Design a binder for this molecule. Structure first.
Ligand code: TW3
Ligand code: TW3
Ligand code: TW3
Ligand code: BTI
Ligand code: BTI
Ligand code: BTI
Lengths: 91, 541, 82, 541, 541
């Protein structure tokens, strides 16, 4: 009510911890601030066959990639690169 | 079979009209001011207090609430403006406490979290009022309570307004025990040191979670122990999670930090073994046919002008579908059936001055809604209540009494929204605070008073003039001005929405464009409890 | 039991009622005390408690001095019987 | 068979002791001061106002009450000191209203009569609070309500504290409707002109009686009609008993004068068709074995000294017979069974500081009394609540929470009497106002606060000194004195019984010699409603 | 939202440890012995009796049960060891009766079938006890009863233990009538001749099925008719399905053979018109994270060693997920929340000697479970109950009484499992037989007695020595040995699980590897009846 919710997330890219401030916009999009830079991200998940694909646009650049979340790890498979991101585990 | 085509409410407003432009500008300015004030309140107690709070390794209360509720879940915060300019020189953001309704483990829960950055979490009278209101809402709607306790006890300089009375601090423990007796879960998370009074909250709760070296429960703090008995002891040895878990037995769970405490709280809420059951018919939801921002143009900020409440109804209900009841009798009142997010609602709104026919129609509609177990929504925009010799001869007061009794005796969930003025006994007749609605919200352009300032000034001037004439004393015009002007100014100040929201006279000021959403949430929270049968008094025909 | 002749059968020695500061001491190390003689006056929690002499026996010694903290149920005066 | 000889409490006090003389002198002075203040309050609004009221041919409110109740019947007036020095420059005797319990046609009834001599019967906030308290008592004890209405509506200059909130003027109509729905009779006698708001009271009542040319009901008075609409009309044509009876239908009976109205009210109460039924065992009454005035010597006015509550118990119970429960465990608390005027009661009184054993004993006794459906009487004389490291390790707070929950969840009638100090959470643990006792009286020597003045001053001084040391700033002794002395003075003023009774924090200050009698009356009024079963929360073992 | 990651119980045992090897070997030997004894019991009454029973064209009782229940459905047989070495020279396999819970036409039903191969179906006292226990289980869990009647009436030589008392043969008819009055279906299938007493079973049943030339109902058999009156008549003319269906009206259905009778019984159960409704939250089932056979290594057969009950909990609960409650207070007791096959359960298990803190924690947890309507599971492994002067001064007995009262007053389904020792009042405190659990199972390594053999011997020796000393008589050491050794031997024999299961002191001895499954079935059968509210006595604080 009368304010915008901001969530603080932490992701371990290899050996480096990165903090992201995600602001939930009214129109369903997200505003992600990583360090100085800010990004407008909007996307969705659609399942074809047995594969779930994330179709997302970041700062007006659109892409799609197969998304698998397994055991505190996030795998994004695309036609230009494969990305593995580690979710921190609470103590 | 639900395939019948049905006409819908609503008309397209003239966006080119100058009146629409002016109303939109004024309402936009009001909403911007409200948003800025809400942001400043959200900032918290202060920068140095926040820095000290972080330096102790603790989370700020809003971060605690964000990490407690389900991800992405909406949060309905109540009374964000409590304490706004309530005290002369002391700033108490949000009343020093944060109360709201959220979703934890798929269960609607009432979260009450103390703000340790505002006077160390001390309880101002407005803080006690806000907590009591939240507890009353949870009791009425049968919602589990979660107390994120970090408080310094009652504020000593204002003790005379905090300790002794019925609606004072002891009512918190009374409500806690009563709601525990009714199988309404109480969970207390001791996130910080509780000097006194607040130490009873974990003791009376059904289940406790305490942080290892932050939370410390003790009936009297080391200063209080020194002042009363003279014994000297450290806070950790007096309280402490280890010293409480190991041999005291007060604590039920032991947490490493705030994140662990919130995780344990979510686990407990999951283990609550509760399932929501709905006792009303449900239909698929559908958006309204008109944008909600147009209300800014339709309503505006000036109360002298009048607008059709059917516009608001069409802008808030599902699919702009509305079934008006007794459309031509008592035209000044609009009563009908609609749906919000699939929930059936009976809408009663004002469209002018209340007449005898309007009161009779409202009584009939309230009786119907109570018979069919349908939640009621009131929209208050009251220019006044009809007064006059011919109306008194027809019992306008007795028809108002009919409507008042019908509203008071109702048992279905009732939600009131003040979109305009609210004066006189019309406020009572349209489910004011005294008649226990489940929720009460106001728009940033509302005005609430016993009557208008000029009416009260005229009444007082006439009283004084008649008394002086009976006494035989002259009553000059300068006396009239000196009697009138302060009354006008006082009535102008006391009618402000921010004045009415600083004290807990409502559950918050809401942006009109958000109205629908808020209502939805409220009605959802209103449907946890089963609907009982309604027993009416004597209908004075 | 009805006549209450045996109602006062219980007897005991002096003890500290609570934990708090000791306001005043009226008993010397070696003295003779009578029935009802005040031993110590202790102030704790906005309340003053006065300890009476249980019997008429003399006092061997005192355990607490002026302005000291005495824990609850702790002996105060070494007391002889009648 | 009830012929067993049973030992009785009580010992003959030493009338020759100097302590007895001093205590008797101090208590006698306090009682004399109380009686003089009560007489001055009884005098009424003022001499000129009384003369004008008589000149209109009307009876003063106390004469109305005397002529209404049965002849020679005792009358239990509540909150005689409401508004005593509450407002800076305005004198409001008795709060401007008279509330009490009396016997009409052999039925216990709650009489609420407006005092027209105090600001024309206008409603101050304390008047609204007093009326709401009386209505709550009538609701809880299931007593018919009689409203002798002669009011000028809400007091406009204080409207912000009278109109809008939940516990404000609208709650009167809400309670009226609710109690009407529960077959609790409402009778309104319109003894005079009601400008506004008060016009709704006869409308919502079950039966009305109005005087011919005195009582006039109108939603808006001629000044209000002129201010709002501009129409000019006389009061009689706007209201009037003839104009209301003949075609309006608001009035149900037509009375020539006040005496006729009271006679009609008695006839209606007779026609109520109600019969009192008792659900408790009854034994023949018997006077106590000791005079009640000796309490003056036993208790005194100085709270530093301590007395055995068994003396008070022996001076108030029937035949001085008392069956103590767990006499040697938790000696600081006295719990037992007795009889007052034949009614069985469970007495719980303080005899020192509350320990863990005392809390456990109190919880056990409350459970027993709730199981056997026995009314509870609490006697508060609280030096404090035990605090300390070893007590926190043993969960003194958790035992206090046990007692608090047990007291709160109780459903038997509960009556609290404050004969001494009442500080801290001990007030909550001994059925304070927040825990809804049926009645609450205090003696003229009581003191109620969150804690002692010196304790609060020491706590604040320690807090400030520690904060300055952490900041690195010097905290001088002059600062300590400037922080302490105002706190001491404020706590001294706010603890006065007259300060606590000016606001409605109790049902009146009572002469100790009358205690027994008052209790009797109260318990009688408490037995009209049936006793329900008690449901307890979770007992945190 | 149920996506939160939650830590799980359980640790991987050291399979290479010699202790694990020895414990596994001992438990495997015990389980093999149990399986062999169960096989021998399953063989039945005897080879010649089975041959004669088959020669009459009838099905053996186990074949009847297999053909009655739904195909592939599991069958939960109760008290397989009733009568095992109970009588000196008479062999009574299974008590001569077969009682179990199965699924007929998708409905959980209690099947009670007489074994005609054991003394012609005569009723031994243990047979009556077993049937009464089965009927009590069906009454408590609201399960339809099916009696496959083939009996020769009461066993005459033991008539004094079968006929006259309250828990004797007449209680069968009493329970039948009572359960009929509560809309719990009774179906009797007369598969063979019933001499007497058993003839009343079809008469009092709601619906009857009788085989044409096998089943014959008569109040007195031809021998009994000859002995009493002297009339001579054949069995078929005295009973017979034709002679009963055609004019007597006792029989309701007529069957050609056993298969037809079972088909008709299934049809009747289908026509029962019953639907199971669950009043508890359900979650998807999940297997535990560790194998169940490892329990053999973890528990072993020697009771002197001790093991963590958390291992068993992790091996039986769903997903090894467990939410411990008050982990550090009263560590000797383990209380928490878990799920079995989706059903929520509150697990209370022993981990040592019961202290005051353990009793208080158990009482609190039982109160919570009763408040939230959650079934309770008790795991008994009792080394003893803490005693001692300091414990008596702290009321160890009173805390045990607290726990006993809390367990007794509980109304949620309760299931007890004895995995180790069970001695003294601890057995009462952990929901023994006297406190009516819905089911009670023991592992093949349990021991149950009032106390240990050596403790009882020492107590008796001390008593005798003190009595002799008071008398003035010498008490020699040979007398001590003669007093001790028989007591040791008797306590050793009476504590055997087979001794406790020969009499109906439990519902059977279960293989630990099957534990989970059995519990599941039991809890399913426990959820047919709705859960009522719990009323507690006086909690002696
Ligand atoms: C029976 C019932 C039902 C209830 C009771 O009996 S209630 C008994 C009395 N309470 C206590 O006994 C707790 C005493 N606190 C403490 O033991 C601590 O202080 C903590 C725990 C609060 C942590 O303190 P902290 O770490 O948050 O720091 P602190 O600077 O101290 O925080 C701000 C400073 O607190 C001052 N302050 C003013 N009023 C209060 C107040 N009422 N309580 C605490 N602090 C207060 C403020 O004026 C100053 O700041 P300012 O105004 O000068 O800028
Ligand atoms: C919706 C709801 C729920 C409620 C409402 O809407 S409430 C609407 C407003 N009320 C009215 O519209 C009634 C207006 N009264 C009148 O029509 C009459 O006055 C009567 C009927 C009261 C008889 O009057 P009376 O015969 O008793 O004489 P009066 O001298 O008049 O009596 C004392 C004098 O009254 C002054 N006075 C001050 N405050 C008030 C006040 N609030 N009401 C009346 N009088 C007031 C006092 O200050 C002065 O004396 P003082 O202080 O100068 O010495
Ligand atoms: C009021 C109430 C509530 C109850 C009553 O009033 S109860 C009244 C008395 N009962 C009868 O009036 C039924 C009398 N039976 C018969 O009419 C038949 O016998 C049948 C029907 C049982 C079929 O008999 P069957 O075909 O199974 O053969 P049978 O060899 O007979 O079977 C084994 C042999 O039965 C001997 N045996 C020992 N005890 C009994 C016993 N109690 N009943 C029957 N048989 C018994 C056994 O000792 C021998 O074998 P063993 O021990 O020598 O090896
Ligand atoms: O509401 C404001 C219009 C002018 C005053 C009308 C008065 S307030 C007293 C009375 N009660 C009503 O509802 N209307 C009149
Ligand atoms: O009651 C006055 C004695 C001194 C203060 C005792 C404190 S007030 C806060 C806490 N709650 C209690 O009941 N006692 C202590
Ligand atoms: O349980 C066996 C240990 C030794 C005996 C303990 C005794 S049995 C009588 C009493 N009741 C208990 O629960 N424990 C003690």
């Amino acid at each position: 009510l009368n304010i915008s919710y901001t969530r603080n997330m932490t992701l371990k890219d290899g050996k480096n911890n990165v903090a992201i401030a995600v602001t939930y916009n009214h129109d369903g999009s997200y505003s992600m601030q990583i360090e100085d830079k800010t990004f407008q991200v909007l996307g969705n998940l659609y399942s074809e066959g047995d594969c779930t694909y994330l179709k997302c646009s970041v700062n007006g650049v659109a892409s799609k990639a197969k998304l698998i979340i397994l055991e505190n790890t996030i795998y994004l498979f695309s036609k230009e690169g494969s990305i593995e991101i580690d979710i921190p585990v609470p103590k | 079979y639900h395939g019948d085509s049905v006409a819908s409410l609503g008309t397209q407003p003239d966006l080119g009209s100058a009146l629409y432009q002016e109303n939109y500008k004024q309402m936009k300015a009001l909403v911007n001011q409200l948003h800025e004030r809400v942001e400043h309140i959200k900032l918290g107690g202060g920068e140095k207090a926040r820095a000290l709070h972080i330096s102790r390794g603790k989370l700020l209360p809003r971060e605690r609430i964000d990490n407690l509720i389900d991800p992405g879940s909406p949060f309905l915060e109540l009374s964000q403006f409590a304490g706004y300019q309530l005290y002369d020189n002391e700033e108490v953001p949000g009343g020093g406490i944060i109360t709201g309704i959220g979703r934890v483990s798929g269960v609607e829960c009432m979260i009450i979290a103390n703000d340790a950055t505002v006077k160390g979490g001390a309880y101002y009278p407005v803080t006690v009022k806000k907590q009591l209101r939240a507890q009353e809402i949870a009791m009425q709607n049968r919602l589990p309570c979660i107390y994120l306790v970090d408080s310094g006890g009652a504020y000593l300089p204002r003790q005379a307004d905090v300790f002794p009375d019925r609606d004072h601090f002891g009512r918190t423990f009374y409500n806690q025990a009563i709601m525990s007796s009714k199988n309404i879960a109480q969970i207390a998370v001791v996130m910080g040191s509780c000097t006194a009074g607040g130490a009873y909250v974990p003791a009376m709760a059904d289940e406790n979670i305490i942080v290892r070296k932050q939370g410390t429960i003790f009936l009297a703090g080391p200063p209080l122990v020194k002042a009363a008995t003279g014994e000297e002891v450290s806070a950790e040895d007096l309280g402490g999670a280890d010293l409480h878990c190991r041999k005291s037995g007060v604590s039920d769970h032991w947490a490493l930090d705030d994140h662990h405490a919130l995780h344990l709280t979510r686990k407990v809420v999951r283990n609550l073994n509760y399932q929501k059951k709905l006792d009303v018919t449900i239909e698929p939801s559908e958006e309204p046919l008109f944008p909600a921002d147009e209300l800014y143009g339709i309503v505006g900020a000036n109360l002298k002008r009048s607008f059709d409440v059917r516009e608001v109804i069409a802008r808030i209900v599902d699919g702009s579908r509305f079934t008006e009841f007794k459309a031509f009798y008592g035209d000044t009142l609009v009563t009908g059936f609609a749906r919000i997010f699939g929930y059936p609602v009976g809408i009663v709104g004002n469209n002018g001055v209340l007449f005898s026919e309007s009161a009779k129609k409202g009584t009939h509609f309230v009786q119907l809604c109570c018979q069919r177990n349908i939640p009621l929504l009131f929209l208050q925009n009251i220019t006044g209540f009809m007064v006059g010799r011919e109306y008194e001869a027809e019992g306008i007061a007795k028809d108002g009494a009919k409507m008042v009794a019908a509203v008071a005796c109702a048992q279905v969930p009732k939600i009131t929204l003040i979109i305009g003025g609210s004066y006189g006994a019309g406020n009572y007749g349209m489910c004011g605070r005294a008649y226990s609605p489940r929720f009460l919200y106001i728009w940033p352009n509302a005005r609430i008073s016993v009557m208008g300032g000029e009416q009260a000034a005229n009444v007082l001037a006439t009283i004084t003039k008649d008394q002086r004439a009976r006494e035989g004393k002259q009553f000059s015009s300068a006396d009239e001005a000196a009697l009138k002007e302060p009354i006008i100014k006082k009535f102008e100040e006391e009618g402000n929405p921010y004045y009415s929201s600083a004290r807990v006279w409502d559950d918050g000021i809401i942006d009109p464009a958000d109205t629908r959403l808020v209502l939805g949430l409220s009605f959802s929270a209103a449907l946890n409890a089963p609907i009982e049968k309604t027993d009416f008094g004597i209908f004075r025909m | 039991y009805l006549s209450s002749v045996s109602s006062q059968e219980t007897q005991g020695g002096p003890l500290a009622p609570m934990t708090g500061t000791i306001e005043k001491v009226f008993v010397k190390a070696g003295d003779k005390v009578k029935a009802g003689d005040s031993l110590m006056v202790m102030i704790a929690m906005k309340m003053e408690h006065t300890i009476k002499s249980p019997k008429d026996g003399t006092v061997k010694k005192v355990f607490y001095r002026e302005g000291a903290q005495a824990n609850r149920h702790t002996p105060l005066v070494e007391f002889e019987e009648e």
